[PDB]
Design an enzyme around this catalytic site. Structure first.
Site, PDB file in Angstrom:
ATOM      1  CD  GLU A   6     -30.570  25.485   3.860  1.00  0.00           C
ATOM      2  OE1 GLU A   6     -30.730  25.409   5.100  1.00  0.00           O
ATOM      3  OE2 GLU A   6     -31.159  24.733   3.065  1.00  0.00           O
ATOM      4  CB  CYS A  45     -39.344  27.901   6.632  1.00  0.00           C
ATOM      5  SG  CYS A  45     -39.026  26.393   5.656  1.00  0.00           S
ATOM      6  NE  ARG A  73     -42.756  29.900   5.637  1.00  0.00           N
ATOM      7  CZ  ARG A  73     -43.369  31.056   5.857  1.00  0.00           C
ATOM      8  NH1 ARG A  73     -44.535  31.060   6.481  1.00  0.00           N
ATOM      9  NH2 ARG A  73     -42.823  32.203   5.461  1.00  0.00           N
ATOM     10  CD1 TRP A  84     -34.872  19.902  -0.352  1.00  0.00           C
ATOM     11  CD2 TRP A  84     -36.375  18.406   0.370  1.00  0.00           C
ATOM     12  NE1 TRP A  84     -36.077  20.209  -0.934  1.00  0.00           N
ATOM     13  CE2 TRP A  84     -37.020  19.307  -0.508  1.00  0.00           C
ATOM     14  CE3 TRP A  84     -37.127  17.372   0.953  1.00  0.00           C
ATOM     15  CZ2 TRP A  84     -38.392  19.203  -0.821  1.00  0.00           C
ATOM     16  CZ3 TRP A  84     -38.494  17.273   0.640  1.00  0.00           C
ATOM     17  CH2 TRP A  84     -39.105  18.182  -0.237  1.00  0.00           C
TER      18      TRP A  84
END
Ligand code: HEM
Ligand code: HEM
Ligand SMILES: Cc1cc(N)nc(C[C@H]2CNC[C@@H]2NCCNCc2cccc(Cl)c2)c1
Ligand SMILES: Cc1cc(N)nc(C[C@H]2CNC[C@@H]2NCCNCc2cccc(Cl)c2)c1
Ligand SMILES: C[C@H](O)[C@H](O)[C@H]1CNc2nc(N)[nH]c(=O)c2N1
Ligand SMILES: C[C@H](O)[C@H](O)[C@H]1CNc2nc(N)[nH]c(=O)c2N1
Ligand SMILES: [Zn+2]
Lengths: 409, 411
Positions: A285, A108, A111, A280
Site C-alpha cells: 500500500e 479488503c 478480512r 494496519w
C-alpha cells in the site's frame, strides 16, 4: 444459481451459495462488465424491509431465528419506525453490524481478521469537540505503541440529511499537499485540494513535505471545525533500507495507522456517515502505491538514480528493481520500529485461508479480484490464480460524496 | 446510451458508444460480476442475421454500405445459405474478419498491431498432412529468422460439426510434460496430459526438460495424426543473465514464437475450429508465468538460492527480487539473439495509446483489466490506472472444449 469458483494453481473448487442473498446491484450487466470501474434520505416504507432483513440475519447468527426474542424485537423496531420514522440499534446489533460490514468488504484482502474489531459506540456525541475526543482515543487504542489493533468509532446515524456527522479527511492521518510556484507539487498530491480547504479554514500549514494534516470534523450538520491530532498520538516510521545506507537520505517516512474516514456504514437501513475504521498496512500500500504511483510521491526515478541503474532503456526493468527495494525498505523500517505491518505474500495467503473458511462456513465470500491482487508481483501471490465472485452484501461500507461538494455552509 | 471510463493517473476520460454493438453475453448480471472467472452447429434460421451483420460492417469499412456490390453479396449469401445451409466467405472478408477478431480480443494487450496481420487461407486443405505443411509454412514465415511477424492460418469452417478440423496442441510450439512415478514432473507441467496423448499416439518422447512437442492434427473430423516440426524451424533462445554468469547454468531456454492453436475463430456466423495464430512475446509471459508460476517450471527457489537472498521469511521479498532478475534475463537473452520481444512497460504504454485511438476512431475498445494488467509490477504500468469496459463483439476468438474430450474416434 449455484456458482463455482476455481483456483488454477491448486485446482480446488468452491461452490458459492451466498451470492443468492445479494441485495444491492453491481454496475455490470449481461452485456457489459464494469469490474474495473472504481465507482460503478430513506422513507418508512423503504426502511422496515431493510431492518427486517438485517434483524433476521442477526437473530439467525445468534441461533434464535424465529424465536420470541426475535419477533419481539422485530415488532419493537417496527413500531418505532412507524412512530419515529427511524430506529436505534441495540449495542449487540451495532457490533454485529460493524463486524459484518467488514466481513462483506469485497475489496479488503485482510478480512480473515474481521471478527476481531473493537467498536466504539460514539452515538452520544453531539459536537466536533466530542468527535475530536473520540477519534483521539480511537487512534491511541488502535496504534497501541506499535502493536496495532483493528477498530472503528461510530458517530450518530443520519436523520434528515441536514444533521450529518462527517469527518472531512479521507483518512484520519495523511500528509498535506501544496501546489508550488515551481509548477510542481509539494507533499502528497492526492491531498492538494483538502490541504487547501484546511487553509481556507485556518490551518497554519508548515508547508513541509510530510505535515500531518489537521482533522476537519463536522457535527450535526454544523460547519466543520479544525483540530490537530496530538503529535504524540500519531506514530510515524522513518524509512531505511537494510543494505542501502544512502536510503535514509531520501528523507522518507510514513505513518503506521491506516484509517479510512470518508465512508458510509449502512446497517439495517440506517446510515452512519461518520465511522472511521482502522487496521494496519500491507507493505505494498505504502511502498508501491503511496511512494511509486506516478500521481503520488512518485519516487521511482530518484531511487533509481541512487541505485546506479541503466534508466536509459525500459527493458532493463530498472523500475521493477527500484520498486522491489522501496518495498523491502517499508517492510524493513516498520518491522524494526516494531510497528505492525504485513507483506503482500503473507496477506494474500491469509485471504485464501479465509476464503475457504467463508465458503465452508457461510457459503461464499464476495471478493473483488481487481483490488485483492497486490499492485506488484501479482501472479506470484496465490490470489492471482484464485477465481473470485463479486457481489454486494449488506451491512456494508459504501462510498459517499466528498462533504465539501455538498455542505450548505 | 453512453458510458465513460476514467484514468486515475492522468484524469483522462473516454466515452464508449461501441458497447452498443455488443451481442454475446459476459457471464455477469446486475447482481454478480464474474470478471475474474477464467471461462464463463447453427441453423439456417440463426445464420443469415449473423451473416448480415458481418457483411454490413465489412461493407461499411470499405465505405460501400448500401452499394450494389453490398446488396448483391447479401442476396448471394442468403441464397447460398438457403441452398447449402452455410456459405463461403470471400478472401477479402476472411482477412477483414480475422483482423477484427484480433482487434476485438479484449484479453489482448498487443492489439495495437491488429491491422498488420498475415492471413493464410488454408480453406482448401483436406488432410492432416495438408495441415502439417500449412503450419510449417506459417512457422517459417512468422519466425522470419528471429524478426517475428504476426500471422494466422485458417483451415476449413465447421459444417455439421462431424467434420471439424482441429489442432490438438494448445500452441504450435510447446515443451512436453512428464509425470514421474515419484510425483514430480519433468518439463512443463501444463502439458502432461497432452504429452500422454502424444506418447499414446506413437510419439517416441525423448523425456527431457525441454522437448518440443509433436503436432497432433485432425482433418475433416478424422482421427488426429502426429508430425514433428522441422527442428531447424523451431527458433529457440537460451536464457542467460547480463550480470549473473551462473544464470546460464540454470539450463533454461524457450521457444521464440507464441502461437495459440486451440481457439475458434467466429466470422459472420461461420465457425473456424482450426485457426492457429501467432505474434511475439511480452517478457512476462515467459519470465513471470511460464517460469515462475508454481504450476509451471517453478524456478523461483533455485534462482533464489543462487542469488542468496534471505529465504527464511517472505518479508525479505526474496521471491519478488528473484522474479525481477528472471524477467531481466528473458528480455536480455531475446534482444541479444535478435528475436522480437517486448517488455511490459513498453507493451502496456502502447496499449493505452492504441486504446485511446480506438475510442476516438471507433467509439470504444473492449478490454479485460484482469488480463491486460501484467502479472508483475501492475501499478507501475499505465494500464493499472485505466478503467476498462469489457464486452464482446464479433468477429471473435472463442474457447472450445479440448478435442480429446469431444472427438468421436474412428479407430
Ligand atoms: C488489519 C488488517 C487489514 C488489512 C491488512 C487490510 C488491507 C486492505 C487493503 C490492501 C485494501 C485495499 C487498499 C487500497 O488499495 O486502497 C483494503 C481496503 C478496504 N478495507 Fe481492509 N484491511 C485491514 C483492516 C480493515 C478494517 C478494520 C476494515 C473495516 C472495519 C477494513 C475495510 C476495508 C474496506 C471497506 C476497504 C475498501 C475501502 C476503499 O475503497 O479504500 N479493512 N484493506
Ligand atoms: C504482436 C504480438 C502480440 C503480443 C505481444 C500480444 C500479447 C498478448 C498477451 C500478453 C496476452 C495474454 C497472454 C496470456 O496470459 O495467455 C494475449 C492474449 C491474446 N492475444 Fe495477443 N498479443 C500479440 C498478438 C496477437 C495476435 C497476432 C493475435 C490474434 C490474431 C492475438 C490474440 C490474442 C487473444 C485472442 C488472446 C487471448 C488468449 C486467451 O484468451 O487464451 N494476440 N496477447
Ligand atoms: C482500514 C484499512 C486498512 C488498510 N491496511 N488499508 C486501508 C486502505 C486505505 C489506506 N490505504 C489506501 C486506502 N484509502 C484510499 C482508498 N481510496 C482509493 C481511491 C482513490 C481515488 C478515488 C477513489 Cl473514489 C478512491 C484501510
Ligand atoms: C498470439 C499470442 C501472442 C502472445 N504474445 N501471447 C499469446 C498468449 C499465449 C502464450 N503465452 C501464454 C498464452 N497461452 C494461452 C493462455 N491460456 C492460459 C490457460 C492455461 C490453463 C487453463 C486456462 Cl482456462 C487458460 C498469444
Ligand atoms: C482503474 C482501476 O480500477 C484502478 O486503478 C484500481 C485497480 N486496482 C486497485 N486495487 C486496490 N487494492 N486499490 C486501488 O486503488 C486499485 N485501483
Ligand atoms: C483466476 C484468474 O482469473 C486467473 O488466474 C487469470 C488472471 N489474469 C490473467 N491474465 C493473463 N494475461 N493471463 C492469465 O492466464 C491470467 N489468469
Ligand atoms: Zn462484471
Amino acid at each position: 444459481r449455484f456458482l463455482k469458483v476455481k483456483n488454477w494453481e491448486t485446482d480446488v473448487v468452491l461452490t458459492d451459495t451466498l451470492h443468492l442473498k445479494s441485495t444491492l446491484e453491481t454496475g455490470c450487466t449481461e452485456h457489459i462488465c464494469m469490474g474495473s470501474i472504481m465507482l460503478p434520505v430513506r422513507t418508512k416504507d423503504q426502511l422496515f424491509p431493510l431492518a427486517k432483513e438485517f434483524l433476521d440475519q442477526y437473530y439467525s447468527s445468534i441461533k434464535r431465528f424465529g424465536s420470541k426474542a426475535h419477533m419481539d424485537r422485530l415488532e419493537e423496531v417496527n413500531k418505532e419506525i412507524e412512530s419515529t420514522s427511524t430506529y436505534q440499534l441495540k449495542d449487540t446489533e451495532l457490533i454485529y453490524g460493524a463486524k459484518h460490514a467488514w466481513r462483506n468488504a469485497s475489496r479488503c484482502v485482510g478480512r480473515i481478521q474481521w471478527s476481531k474489531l473493537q467498536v466504539f459506540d460514539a452515538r452520544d456525541c453531539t459536537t466536533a469537540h466530542g468527535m475530536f475526543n473520540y477519534i483521539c482515543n480511537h487512534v491511541k487504542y488502535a496504534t497501541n505503541k506499535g502493536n496495532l489493533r483493528s477498530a472503528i468509532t461510530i458517530f450518530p446515524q443520519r436523520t434528515d440529511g441536514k444533521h450529518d456527522f462527517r469527518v472531512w479527511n479521507s483518512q484520519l492521518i495523511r500528509y498535506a499537499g501544496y501546489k508550488q510556484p515551481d509548477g510542481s507539487t509539494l507533499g502528497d498530491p492526492a491531498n492538494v485540494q483538502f490541504t487547501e480547504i484546511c487553509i481556507q479554514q485556518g490551518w497554519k500549514a508548515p508547508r513541509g513535505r510530510f505535515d500531518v494534516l489537521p482533522l476537519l470534523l463536522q457535527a450535526n450538520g454544523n460547519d466543520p471545525e479544525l483540530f490537530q491530532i496530538p503529535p504524540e498520538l500519531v506514530l510515524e516510521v522513518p524509512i531505511r533500507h537494510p543494505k542501502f545506507d544512502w536510503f535514509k537520505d531520501l528523507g522518507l517516512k510514513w505513518y503506521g495507522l491506516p484509517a479510512v474516514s470518508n465512508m458510509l456504514l449502512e446497517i439495517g437501513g440506517l446510515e452512519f456517515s461518520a465511522c472511521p475504521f482502522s487496521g494496519w498496512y500491507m507493505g505494498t500500500e505504502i511502498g508501491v502505491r503511496d511512494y511509486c504511483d506516478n500521481s503520488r510521491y512518485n519516487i521511482l526515478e530518484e531511487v533509481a538514480k541512487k541505485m546506479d541503474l541503466d534508466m536509459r532503456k525500459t527493458s532493463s526493468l530498472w523500475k521493477d528493481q527500484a520498486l522491489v527495494e522501496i518495498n523491502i525498505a517499508v517492510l524493513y523500517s516498520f518491522q524494526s520500529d516494531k510497528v505492525t505491518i504485513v507483506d503482500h505474500h503473507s496477506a494474500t495467503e491469509s485471504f485464501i485461508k479465509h476464503m475457504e473458511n467463508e465458503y465452508r462456513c457461510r457459503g461464499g465470500c464476495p471478493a473483488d479480484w481487481v483490488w485483492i491482487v497486490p499492485p506488484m508481483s501479482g501472479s506470484i501471490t496465490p490470489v492471482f490464480h484464485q477465481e473470485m465472485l463479486n457481489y454486494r452484501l449488506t451491512p456494508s461500507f459504501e462510498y459517499q460524496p466528498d462533504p465539501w461538494n455538498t455542505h450548505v455552509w
